[PDB]
Design a protein around this ligand. Structure first.
Ligand SMILES: CCCCCCCCCCCCCCCCC[C@@H](O)O[C@H](CO[C@H](O)CCCCCCCCCCCCCCC)COP(=O)(O)OCC[N+](C)(C)C
Ligand SMILES: CCCCCCCC/C=C\CCCCCCCC(=O)OC[C@H](COP(=O)(O)OCCN)OC(=O)CCCCCCC/C=C\CCCCCCCC
Ligand SMILES: CCCCCCCC/C=C\CCCCCCCC(=O)O[C@H](COC(=O)CCCCCCC/C=C/CCCCCCCC)COP(=O)(O)OCCN
Ligand SMILES: CCCCCCCCCCCC(=O)SCCNC(=O)CCNC(=O)[C@H](O)C(C)(C)COP(=O)(O)O
Lengths: 55, 84, 165, 175, 124, 88, 52, 63, 178, 128, 459, 70
């Protein structure tokens, strides 16, 4: 709709002097575009695996 | 719930080399002086629903007729509602 | 994004064929399956057509632009040559797959156990089928522009991908 | 939010455009966010209000520790171990403060690049310049001290740098 | 492309080299030399934060395309006109560049012809 | 899988079936206990071809040492049953 | 032989690249001087483009 | 009913917890959540200030 | 696999094995059934031309050039049955094969389920316990001085006797236990 | 005639292409027979031990113990100082060390010289 | 610091006055209680230290090592409960006495305000280990192994003592605080070169350094389970702790005296890793893996950068835990098979699935899988070495690959495949072994949540 | 959760009308989509902007003198 983009640096893991390592998530075009496609493919593959791997 | 219906093996005399490429193989072998002892064994590969075949072009154009009909109907409807 | 859809569908179709053919993977023992199993057949044809970049399919909207940008760029000539030969060989192996496993007379053992009547398989295949048909158009038209288009091309350079395919 | 200082961490006014619908068809985004508000934000807000009132019913304070200033290493005798101890602890505290200052500037730089988006190179020049200056000062102060760093080694590094600068300036003047 | 064949199989100095182009002054041909016009000023083009590679003379039509795309969001095939306008402006830019290429090529042709004629006259 | 649990009757039926389309063997004289080299007068190469026909029919291949000493349909059936662990 | 031939042809194609009969792309504001790097206190040599 | 109970126990409670943690703990610290600045084009009006961006050069149009 | 190996292979066995290998590789080369039938009949005709040859030296000279012709045209990717030592499902089910003696370690709570099966197992254990005592002496009596010459075992010759060394042959887990 | 196959170390000679198998003498047949006799004796022993109901343990394999002992503990008592051994030990134990020392020393000397000259551009180099 | 020492001393009278059938229970319970008490040392400051007294002091380098040492003892008790079943009560009490003495010596070693006291306890830890190896060992080679494990160590440590007293005759004090504050540069001289060598070789012989490592495979293979535990977990880290403490006075000689050893480590971590690829013994493979990891630790310490020190500390802790788990798994297999050969028992995943899960987790942790502290230490050391020189990464990269290979090799040969047919004494795994593996593996995954506890004093 | 289908032993396996009609419908949908996209969007393959001829450009707009002035 608009082009929303965000980082969530939520949990601060540690700090090595002047370097800060934290649990950070980037929600750019690539992330929001590759999320549903992978989820859809995994959904279809799992539904097929219910039949293929029944025995 | 499994497939236990006592399937019956059909008679062995139906399978005939007649009408199959194995006839041409037999002709070519007899032209040299030989015979295929297993010609009838594979005959079921050309007897039932396997007799008719499909080419590559026909395989690719699987639903071309119905898709074309739907396309013509859609374009006719589009032309008839736009010109208003 | 496009490869995800159509390659996953192709693998699922191959797996369905393998399962229905008593765990046999060699194409030398797969014969007439265009009629023996219709849904796997049409799904695999659609997947092969999308993979080879038939126009206005999922593969077209990415692969055709790839070929267009590679041809119309300051690159090494060997790179374009190898890319075009690779596209031709892609068409070649798709042709090999379809011809060996469907068109020929059945070569599988006499005890026929081929069946497709399972809702899970049909639903899982058809979801990626509709994906491989429409995701290209919807995704390509629903994203903001991010590059300069190649508006003007020679006629022969515009059609090169289809020619080699 | 008042939980932090707006002057240490500045932000632009963050201008946002107004919605300008061009067609009469309704977008799903506003409906989805309205139902999200109604179904998520209100219960969470109510729970937070309850928790905040519970916290306000029992309030207590904690304080920031103030540390006095002590003579540094530049005014210590040879073997006067107590005053070297005090100066070393003060120097270590100053080192920690310097590390946190560099972290603050790095945070500013990281935030600005993200905020700027496509036009980040031109816009973040102010942040980049500040980080370059602070990093140069920090590298002059503390770089190459080693694992067993101390105030004496830092003082020796500063003395050698000052000698080099004095010699260079004298050579330039007497060129 | 044929120019690749003409350069790599024929005379290299006969035709230009894209890297160092252009090798001739702008006013060598004609003194009219009207300048290119830019519509989108620096401030709005920066605020739109398009891209560094999309900040060309066709930026205003890109702005209109983005405006339509953001405004009429769900009906993603509504504003097709500005897409055509941006494509037209890009095509005009490309044919302008091709005109520059052809001009440089024939300028080099005529310069080499002038040098050959001068050398022949000096010999004779 | 969905593979039916084939039985001894099925094995014997399929073995005899395969042996009947072998045009070199007369179906009338053929029996479950008929020897190959003596009762049907077949050559060793024909025995190998019979083994390969059984291999293609049943989808599994018999080792050469075990295959070279299968001279009756009954013992072929017994070998296949012992391979696939058939109860009845 | 396959690997060596591939490497040699890659080098040859590097020496003989591929491009279109086109000139360099032109950017409006001093070749995007301000937006690429910056330095607004330098006043560089202006680059003006050719309308044909 | 199974769908409803799954949707209330597998989606609603996690999103409640996540939204509470993001809104009242993560956001409380600076620069934890940094959002891309929204695009501004000629002609939009700003909610906060109310000023309107001027239009462009009114360049030539045709085809 | 079930038959004990011999000390060597005679000329007849080697001829049969090369015939089988050549036919299999020809089937791999000739994908379709009619073409395979034609070329297999042609190969059989080419193969029994020297069937009636007598002397050993020329026969050994043959089956050599033939061995070499096979190796030149051996179809580097031949068809292999899935359960064969080269198949895609050669040892797919070998992780589901559990030894029988594991059932001796089952907890009494687990053994409470399936009572009849464990009663039958105890009966089999008793039968084995007596049988082994018989078979060890039967094998000792049967063997020639200097030990066995082939890994072939004799059958049982008495009434209640059982074939020697049968416990780990009869109690194979299954082809597809799970 | 057909193009010949040349065996190598990692691609051995096929059993069917071996010249030796084709030429057979009685001594060869007797050797095969006695090889099979030894194998049959070992198999009889293993089957007698394997099927015994009273055995509830590991059937010890002398061959496995011999293999492990020869691979681990029998190396040194059979070692003899020989020009081949001395040369190979010296090479494989000394050459790599000096090679890596030379490489690292040259790299670090170049880096330190550049550092002293001041032309290395260590901007933003804080953590080390 | 005495609140930890005194309960450890009281562990002995309780052990000796216990009933004949309650020694293990009381020992385990009170060792766990002492571990819970020693957990309080983890509260450190960014300033100097926790100077309890003139004799004992604690730091963020000594606290994790002390916690690991105290936590190790109950695990050794559970491991040794099995093979000592048919032993006399007096001998079992003697075994527990040796373990308690070893833990007490290590605890008093890791505080050590003074260097001579540190040397005395660092050498006192040698006696109970030798007695454990040479007395309760299974094979006939154990005696020889003990000799090796002794003399190598002594050959390194006797010169160091001399160096130590020499420093006291020149500096005037061996207290670590005075030594740190009154440090002076070492002039480039032959005397200083030999002082450096004497100070360094004593700790490099116990890492072990490549070429001086021939004692470790013998000591690890021929020792009982508890001996291998304590050797791989804590005793190897004495050299690392000593090296970090000792150096503060070796500058700036270490700038060029490090060259012979770094190479010996940089190549060595390769060689031993390759040795793991061709092995017929599980214990030997684990020992050589430990050698490779300690070689990386040696490189880290000799680089002498803050990131090097942090990575080295994390790596020592993680390696101790992982090697203890691997030795426990190998011993559990051996107690059933009685052969200690990789190729004999195969396909044990089908028979013992939960033990196979423990094997997989231990192999993954040893493989340096993120975000485990093993990888944290490995990556910090690698980055510091890259800062030291850009070419080092090559060797490091190689080592990583080789590591993974042999690790999964260990997992594939033993757990995967088809079971050995003639082995029919593989009983189901007890609760004791499973609890041992769980108590081994849970602390690693818990420590990966709070890495700052094990990153050393330079964090 | 399908229906019961028996093996045929050298005969064509049973097919239900459901899968046949589904396959036919999906193929027809794909081909209709292809034809519709070609009709409504023809410039994607054939091109919308003609490629100019550089040799056809008159020399006036190209900035060349008759080989004498410069
Ligand atoms: C076996 C498994 C490994 C065990 C551990 C092995 C590690 C021990 C290696 C010892 C480190 C190196 C020793 C001395 C290093 C100093 C550098 C010196 O050797 O290089 C040149 C020295 O030149 C020559 O090397 C002189 C010494 C020659 C005699 C050395 C013997 C060479 C091989 C001996 C190896 C034996 C090792 C095992 C002992 C049992 C420098 O020339 P120069 O500028 O003038 O001297 C600078 C020093 N000053 C300023 C104090 C004067
Ligand atoms: C669940 C059931 C409970 C529901 C009620 C709780 C609702 C949420 C409110 C909880 C209160 C907020 C809280 O948890 O405290 C914040 C607290 C952080 O503490 P701070 O001091 O602010 O920063 C860290 C530096 N010390 O947040 C948390 O710890 C919880 C969320 C952390 C993120 C999730 C962790 C998952 C990853 C685990 C580690 C994996 C390896 C590390 C990889 C790091 C990547 C480089
Ligand atoms: C696992 C095997 C490892 C064995 C340890 C190897 C390391 C050997 C270290 C050297 C041994 C002696 C160390 C000296 C103790 C420190 C004291 C010191 O250095 O003081 C020096 C004394 O230096 C010496 O005397 C050292 C001489 C060495 C004598 C013993 C030789 C032992 C063998 C040497 C070669 C081995 C070194 C490398 C071994 C590699 C591993 C095999 C200065 O004395 P002053 O006279 O007061 O000052 C001079 C100005 N007035
Ligand atoms: C596709 C890859 C290339 C393949 C090429 C291979 C070469 C093929 C041509 C081989 C030529 C030969 O036959 S080489 C001829 C070798 N010499 C003999 O065969 C003489 C005696 N023959 C026998 O004894 C047999 O066993 C027999 C009597 C036939 C059966 O006996 P049975 O009663 O026990 O069935």
């Amino acid at each position: 709709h608009t082009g929303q983009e965000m980082i969530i640096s939520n949990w601060h893991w540690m700090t090595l002097q002047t370097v800060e390592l934290s649990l950070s998530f980037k929600m750019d075009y690539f992330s929001v575009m590759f999320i549903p496609v992978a989820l859809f493919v995994t959904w279809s593959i799992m539904e097929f695996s219910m039949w293929y791997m029944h025995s | 719930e499994h497939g236990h219906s006592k399937m019956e093996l059909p008679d062995y005399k139906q399978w005939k080399i007649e009408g199959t490429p194995l006839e041409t193989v037999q002709e070519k072998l007899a032209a040299r002086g030989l015979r295929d002892p297993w010609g009838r064994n594979e005959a079921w590969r050309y007897s039932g629903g396997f007799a008719n075949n499909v080419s590559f072009v026909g395989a690719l154009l699987k639903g071309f007729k119905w898709g074309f009909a739907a396309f013509v109907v859609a374009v006719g409807a589009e032309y008839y509602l736009e010109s208003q | 994004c496009m490869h995800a859809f159509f390659k996953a569908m192709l693998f699922m179709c191959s797996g369905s064929i393998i399962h229905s053919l008593n765990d046999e993977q060699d194409i030398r023992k797969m014969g007439g399956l265009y009629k023996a199993m219709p849904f796997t057949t049409t799904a695999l044809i659609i997947g092969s057509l999308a993979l080879t970049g038939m126009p206005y399919l999922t593969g077209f909207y990415s692969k055709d632009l790839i070929i267009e940008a590679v041809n119309m760029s300051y690159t090494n000539a060997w790179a374009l040559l190898m890319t075009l030969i690779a596209t031709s060989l892609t068409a070649a192996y798709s042709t090999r797959i379809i011809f060996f496993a469907f068109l020929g007379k059945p070569r599988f053992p006499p005890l026929v156990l081929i069946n497709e009547n399972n809702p899970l398989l049909i639903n899982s295949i058809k979801r990626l089928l509709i994906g491989s048909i429409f995701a290209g158009f919807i995704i390509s038209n629903n994203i903001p522009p991010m590059t300069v288009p190649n508006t003007t091309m020679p006629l022969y350079m515009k059609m090169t991908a289809l020619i080699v395919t | 939010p008042d939980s932090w200082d707006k002057d240490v961490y500045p932000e632009p006014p963050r201008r946002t455009p107004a919605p300008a619908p061009q067609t009469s068809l309704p977008n799903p985004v506003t409906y989805l966010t309205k139902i999200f508000d109604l179904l998520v934000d209100r219960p969470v807000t109510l729970a937070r209000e309850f928790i905040e009132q519970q916290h306000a019913k029992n309030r207590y304070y904690y304080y920031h520790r103030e540390f006095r200033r002590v003579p540094d290493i530049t005014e210590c005798e040879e073997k006067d171990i107590l005053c070297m101890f005090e100066a070393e602890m003060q120097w270590r505290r100053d080192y920690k403060v310097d590390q946190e200052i560099v972290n603050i500037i790095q945070e500013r730089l990281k935030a600005c690049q993200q905020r700027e988006g496509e036009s980040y190179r031109q816009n973040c020049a102010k942040e980049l310049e500040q980080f370059t200056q602070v990093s140069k000062a920090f590298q002059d102060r503390y770089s190459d001290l080693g694992a067993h760093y101390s105030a004496r080694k830092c003082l020796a590094k500063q003395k050698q740098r000052m000698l080099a600068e004095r010699k260079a300036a004298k050579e330039a003047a007497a060129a | 492309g044929a120019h690749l064949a003409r350069r790599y199989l024929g005379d290299a100095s006969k035709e230009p080299d894209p890297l160092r182009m252009p090798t001739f002054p702008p006013d060598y041909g004609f003194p009219e030399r009207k300048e290119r016009e830019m519509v989108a000023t620096q401030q709005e083009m920066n605020d739109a934060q398009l891209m560094l590679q999309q900040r060309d003379y066709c930026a205003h039509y890109l702005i209109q395309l983005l405006k339509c795309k953001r405004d009429s969001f769900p009906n993603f095939l509504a504003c097709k006109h500005e897409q055509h306008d941006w494509d037209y402006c890009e095509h005009l830019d490309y044919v302008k560049r091709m005109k520059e290429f052809e001009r440089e090529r024939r300028l080099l042709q005529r310069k080499k012809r002038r040098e050959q004629r001068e050398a022949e006259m000096a010999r004779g | 899988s969905d593979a039916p649990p084939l039985t001894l009757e099925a094995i014997k039926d399929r073995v005899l079936y395969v042996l009947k389309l072998y045009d070199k063997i007369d179906p009338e004289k053929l029996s479950v206990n008929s020897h190959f080299m003596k009762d049907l007068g077949l050559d060793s190469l024909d025995q190998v071809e019979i083994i390969m026909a059984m291999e293609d029919e049943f989808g599994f291949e018999i080792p050469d040492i075990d295959a070279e000493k299968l001279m009756c349909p009954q013992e072929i059936v017994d070998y296949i049953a012992d391979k696939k662990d058939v109860y009845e | 032989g396959f690997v060596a031939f591939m490497l040699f042809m890659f080098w040859v194609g590097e020496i003989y690249p591929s491009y279109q009969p086109v000139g360099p792309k032109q950017y409006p504001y001093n070749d995007l001087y301000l937006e690429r790097g910056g330095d607004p206190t330098k006043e560089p040599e202006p680059v003006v483009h050719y309308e044909i | 009913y199974r769908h409803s109970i799954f949707a209330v126990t597998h989606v609603l409670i996690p999103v409640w917890i996540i939204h509470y943690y993001l809104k009242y703990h993560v956001t409380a610290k600076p620069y934890t959540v940094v959002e891309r600045k929204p695009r501004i084009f000629p002609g939009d009006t700003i909610l906060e200030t109310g000023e309107v961006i001027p239009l462009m050069k009114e360049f030539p149009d045709q085809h | 696999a079930f038959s004990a190996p011999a000390a060597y292979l005679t000329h007849q066995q080697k001829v049969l094995r090369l015939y089988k290998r050549a036919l299999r590789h020809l089937e791999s080369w000739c994908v379709h059934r009619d073409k395979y039938r034609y070329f297999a009949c042609l190969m059989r005709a080419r193969f029994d031309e020297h069937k009636n040859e007598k002397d050993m030296v020329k026969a050994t000279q043959l089956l050599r050039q033939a061995e070499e012709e096979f190796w030149y045209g051996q179809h580097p990717q031949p068809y292999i049955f899935p359960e064969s030592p080269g198949g895609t499902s050669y040892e797919r089910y070998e992780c589901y094969k559990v030894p029988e003696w594991c059932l001796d370690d089952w907890h009494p709570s687990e053994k409470a389920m399936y009572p009849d099966y464990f009663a039958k197992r105890e009966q089999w254990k008793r039968l084995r316990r007596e049988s082994w005592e018989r078979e060890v002496k039967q094998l000792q009596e049967e063997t020639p001085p200097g030990g066995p010459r082939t890994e072939a075992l004799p059958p049982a010759r008495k009434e209640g006797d059982l074939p020697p060394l049968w416990w780990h042959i009869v109690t194979r887990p299954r082809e597809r236990p799970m | 005639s057909f193009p010949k196959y040349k065996p190598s170390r990692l691609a051995t000679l096929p059993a069917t292409l071996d010249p030796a198998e084709y030429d057979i003498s009685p001594e060869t047949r007797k050797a095969q027979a006695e090889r099979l006799a030894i194998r049959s004796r070992l198999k009889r022993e293993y089957l007698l031990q394997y099927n015994d109901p009273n055995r509830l343990g590991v059937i010890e394999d002398p061959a496995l113990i011999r293999w492990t002992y020869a691979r681990s503990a029998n190396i040194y008592p059979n070692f003899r100082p020989t020009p081949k051994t001395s040369l190979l030990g010296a090479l494989f134990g000394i050459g790599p060390l000096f090679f890596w020392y030379y490489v690292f020393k040259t790299d670090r000397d170049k880096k330190e010289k550049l550092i002293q000259e001041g032309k290395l551009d260590q901007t933003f180099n804080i953590s080390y | 610091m005495l609140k930890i020492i005194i309960p450890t001393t009281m562990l002995l009278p309780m052990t000796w006055m216990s009933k004949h059938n309650m020694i293990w229970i009381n020992a385990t319970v009170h060792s766990l209680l002492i571990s819970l008490i020693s957990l309080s040392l983890l509260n450190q400051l960014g300033e100097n230290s926790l100077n309890f007294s003139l004799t004992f002091f604690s730091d963020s380098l000594s606290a994790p090592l002390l916690v690991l040492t105290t936590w190790l003892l109950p695990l050794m008790l559970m491991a040794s409960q099995s093979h000592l079943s048919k032993e006399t009560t007096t001998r079992k009490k003697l075994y527990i006495t040796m373990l308690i003495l070893l833990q007490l010596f290590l605890i008093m070693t890791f505080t050590a305000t003074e260097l001579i006291l540190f040397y005395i306890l660092f050498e006192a830890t040698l006696v109970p280990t030798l007695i454990i190896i040479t007395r309760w060992g299974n094979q006939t080679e154990r005696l020889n192994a003990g000799l090796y494990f002794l003399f190598y160590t002594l050959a390194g440590s006797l010169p160091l003592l001399v160096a130590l007293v020499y420093i006291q005759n020149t500096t005037g004090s061996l207290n670590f605080l005075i030594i740190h504050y009154w440090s002076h540069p070492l002039s480039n001289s032959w005397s200083n070169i030999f002082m450096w060598l004497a100070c360094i070789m004593a700790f490099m012989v116990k890492m072990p350094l490549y070429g001086l490592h021939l004692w470790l495979p013998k000591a690890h293979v021929e020792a009982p389970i508890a001996g291998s535990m304590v050797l791989a977990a804590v005793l190897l880290k004495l050299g690392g702790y000593g090296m970090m403490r000792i150096t503060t006075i070796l500058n700036p000689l270490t700038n060029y005296m490090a060259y012979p050893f770094l190479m010996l480590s940089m190549w060595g971590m390769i060689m031993t890793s390759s040795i793991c690829l061709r092995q017929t013994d599980l214990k030997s493979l684990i020992a050589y893996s430990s050698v490779s990891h300690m070689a990386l630790v040696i490189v880290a310490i000799m680089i002498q950068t803050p990131w090097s020190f942090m990575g080295a500390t994390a790596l020592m802790i993680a390696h101790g835990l992982t090697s203890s788990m691997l030795f426990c798994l190998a011993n559990t297999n051996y107690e059933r098979v009685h052969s200690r050969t990789m190729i004999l028992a195969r396909g044990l995943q089908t028979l013992l699935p939960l033990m196979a899960t423990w094997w997989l987790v231990a192999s993954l942790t040893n493989l340096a899988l993120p975000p485990s502290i093993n990888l944290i230490g490995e990556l910090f050391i690698i980055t510091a070495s890259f800062s030291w020189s850009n070419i080092t990464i090559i060797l490091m990269g190689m080592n990583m690959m080789i590591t993974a290979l042999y690790s999964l090799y260990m997992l594939i040969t033993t757990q995967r495949g088809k079971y050995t047919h003639h082995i029919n004494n593989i009983k189901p795994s007890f609760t004791r072994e499973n609890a041992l593996m769980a108590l081994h593996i849970l602390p690693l995954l818990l420590l990966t949540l709070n890495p700052k506890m094990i990153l050393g004093p330079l964090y | 959760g399908g229906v019961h289908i028996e093996p045929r032993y050298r005969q064509f396996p049973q097919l239900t009308r459901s899968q046949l009609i589904q396959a036919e419908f999906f193929s027809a949908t794909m081909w209709f989509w292809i034809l519709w996209r070609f009709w409504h969007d023809s410039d994607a393959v054939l091109g919308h902007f003609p490629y100019p001829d550089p040799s056809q450009w008159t020399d006036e707009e190209l900035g060349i003198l008759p080989d004498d002035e410069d």
